[PDB]
């Protein structure tokens, strides 16, 4: 075992990288004021995420395996996520609706809810802009611990994630370590 070593680089508003994260965010969260957008540089978590991506790309054909989603969390889970990512222990902070794992919203305004990006003592809310390996997904249920198996004859091979609606997804549930990378942290208020 390694990692637990990361750097946090604050993006300057003059920087286009900032305006791109802010634009995807403002599509649903234009009513909030961004205090800072930081980039989370965890090399060991990133290398493990890329190696999972190389595998998914080599098995899911034409599928765009990676999506950039949102994850709202409390002020105190920021150290944890920045070190471990969204590991199996962090599952116990999320819901169970579509299975035991980590939930990611498509629209930042779902993740902006006070139940998820709980405002701290200063009133700051934390929403991550995560790189998620969504791959091939099915419909989820509360009883899941691992994604359902694709084929009944071949049940060793399973779905990569689960969603609320397969034709019009709004949220995804990831179940394995290294499936999600907390690339950006968006800190904001009301």
Ligand X SMILES: CC#Cc1ccc2c(=O)[nH]c(CSc3ccc(C(=O)O)cc3)nc2c1C
Label residue 93 exposed, middle or buried (CB < 10 Å: 0-12, 13-18, 19+): middle
Q: Which of 94, 109, 163, 179 lies at the binding interface for ligand X (CB under 6 A)?
A: 94
Residue 188 within binding range of ligand X, rule CB under 6 A: no
Residue 96 within binding range of ligand X, rule CB under 6 A: no
Q: Which of 6, 32, 86, 103 lies at the binding interface for ligand X (CB under 6 A)?
A: 103
Nearer to ligand X, 115 or 122 (CB): 115
Residue 111 within binding range of ligand X, rule CB under 6 A: yes
Please choose, out of 28-36, 81-89, 94-102, 135-143, the segment that lies near ligand X by the rule CB under 6 A: 94-102
Residue 140 within binding range of ligand X, rule CB under 6 A: no
Q: For residues 27 and 108, is the Cβ–Cβ distance under 8 A?
A: yes
Q: Which of 32, 116, 184, 188 lies at the binding interface for ligand X (CB under 6 A)?
A: 116
β-sheet with 102-105: strand ranges across: 7-10, 33-41, 180-189, 125-133, 66-73, 102-105, 171-174, 161-163, 137-139
Residue 73 within binding range of ligand X, rule CB under 6 A: yes
Q: Which of 97, 107, 148, 158 lies at the binding interface for ligand X (CB under 6 A)?
A: 97
Residue 110 within binding range of ligand X, rule CB under 6 A: yes
Which contacts of 114-123 are long-range, i.e. CB under 8 A and separated by 24 or more positions?
Answer: 116/71, 116/72, 116/73, 117/72, 117/73, 117/74, 118/73, 118/74, 118/75, 119/189, 119/190, 120/74, 120/75, 123/189, 123/190
Cβ at position 1, least distance to ligand X in Å: 25
Q: Which residues bind ligand X (CB under 6 A)?
A: 70-73, 93-95, 97, 103, 105, 110-111, 115-116, 171
């Amino acid at each position: 075992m390694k990692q637990q070593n990361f750097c946090v680089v604050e993006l300057l508003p003059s920087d286009p990288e900032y305006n791109t994260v802010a634009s995807k965010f403002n599509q649903t969260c234009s009513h909030f004021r961004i205090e800072k957008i930081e980039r989370i540089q965890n090399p060991d978590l990133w290398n493990s995420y890329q190696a999972k991506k190389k595998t998914m790309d080599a098995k899911n054909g034409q599928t765009m395996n990676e999506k950039q989603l949102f994850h709202g969390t409390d002020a105190g889970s920021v150290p944890h996520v920045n070190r471990n990512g969204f590991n199996r222990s962090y599952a116990g902070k999320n819901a169970v609706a579509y299975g035991k794992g980590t939930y990611f919203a498509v629209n930042a305004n779902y993740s902006a809810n006070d139940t998820y990006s709980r405002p701290d003592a200063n009133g700051r809310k934390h929403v991550y802009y995560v790189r998620v390996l969504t791959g091939i997904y099915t419909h989820g249920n509360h009883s899941l611990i691992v994604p359902p198996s694709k084929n009944p004859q071949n049940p060793t091979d399973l779905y990569d994630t689960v969603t609320d609606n397969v034709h019009h997804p709004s949220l995804f549930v990831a179940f394995y370590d290294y499936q999600a990378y907390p690339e950006y942290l968006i800190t904001f208020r009301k």
